[PDB]
Amino acid sequence: MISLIAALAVDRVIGMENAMPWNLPADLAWFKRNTLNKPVIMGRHTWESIGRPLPGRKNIILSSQPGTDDRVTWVKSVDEAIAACGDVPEIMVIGGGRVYEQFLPKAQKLYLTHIDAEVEGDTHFPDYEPDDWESVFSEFHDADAQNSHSYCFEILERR
Ligand SMILES: NC(=O)c1ccc[n+]([C@@H]2O[C@H](COP(=O)([O-])OP(=O)(O)OC[C@H]3O[C@@H](n4cnc5c(N)ncnc54)[C@H](OP(=O)(O)O)[C@@H]3O)[C@@H](O)[C@H]2O)c1
Ligand SMILES: Nc1nc(=O)c2nc(CNc3ccc(C(=O)N[C@@H](CCC(=O)O)C(=O)O)cc3)cnc2[nH]1
């Protein structure tokens, strides 16, 4: 099973040239909880902004170019990224935009965080059709002293 995890602002914005203008540690705890002990597949731009290997996960980085950090696994295509995951119950694709686009048609589950923030971004989560997906879990949270904006966690499973 392939899943995608992402945090989207309005208009499905997931990235901009500069750091996102929000602080959502609860969302990062959710990302950690849902990715721990699973392989995570990411694109090279996302690798760079994470800055280190994610602990307790097998880190697979897609890049057309030779790898530059022997602590993680580098692959040059989607089929190779999947093959590097081995025989696991769930592969987590953690972005970014170009990677989500390529894995969305393969995915059976989406873990999405919807952030009540309007930002201009250069990178979007792909268009998905609500009717293709069944919302199996959703949990809204208000902003609070640690989290700058309200946000809602949702898990969708492919119909
Ligand atoms: N809010 C969120 O949930 C979230 C999640 C993840 C990322 N992001 C954000 O999204 C942005 C990054 O998105 P992006 O679309 O720019 O970058 P990305 O998808 O992270 O990385 C793209 C790079 O990955 C490699 N790649 C992708 N598909 C490949 C394939 N089939 N074969 C070989 N290499 C492949 C290429 O690396 P080479 O260039 O080395 O060939 C390509 O330049 C940032 O702003 C980041 O912080 C947000
Ligand atoms: N829901 C969601 N929110 C995100 O911010 C997000 N970010 C990415 C890509 N970027 C990142 C950036 C940093 C970390 C990170 O540092 N995570 C740590 C800290 C978790 C915590 O603070 O509790 C980790 O161990 O997962 C992960 C992914 C992919 N999917 C996401 N999904």
Residue whose structure tokens are 């970014």: 96
Report the C-alpha gap between 69 and 102 in whole angstroms: 24
CB burial of residue 95 (10 Å; 0-12, 13-18, 19+): buried
Q: Which fold, 1-159? A: Dihydrofolate Reductase, subunit A (3.40.430)
Q: What is the experimental resolution, given in Å to one decimal place?
A: 1.9
Tell me the two tokens of residue 10.
Answer: 């309005």
Closest listed residue to residue 148, CA positions, set 26, 50, 31: 26
Question: β-strand 2-8 against 91-93: which pairing, if any?
Answer: parallel
Q: Which atom of ligand 1 is nearest to the CA of 97?
A: 15
Q: What angle do CA 96, 145, 153 make, to 5 degrees?
A: 40
Name the residue of 31, 46, 103 whose CB sits within 8 Å of the most ligand 1 atoms, as the mutation to test its pocket.
46
Question: β-strand 133-141 against 151-158: which pairing, if any?
Answer: antiparallel
Q: Return the exposure string of 37-66: e unless at least 16 CB atoms fall within 10 Å of the residue's CB, then b.
A: ebbbbbbbbbbeeeeebbeebbbbbbeeee
* Residue 150 exposure: Cα atoms within 13 Å on the Cβ side: 6
Is any atom of ligand 1 closer than 6 Å to the C-beta of 37?
no
- Main-chain dihedrals φ then ψ at residue 89, nearest 5 degrees: -75, -30
Contacting residues for 49 by C-beta, under 8 A, at least 6 apart: none
- Structure letter (DSSP) for residue 13: E
**Determination approach:** X-ray
Contacting residues for 57 by C-beta, under 8 A, at least 6 apart: 35, 36, 37, 38, 39, 40, 92
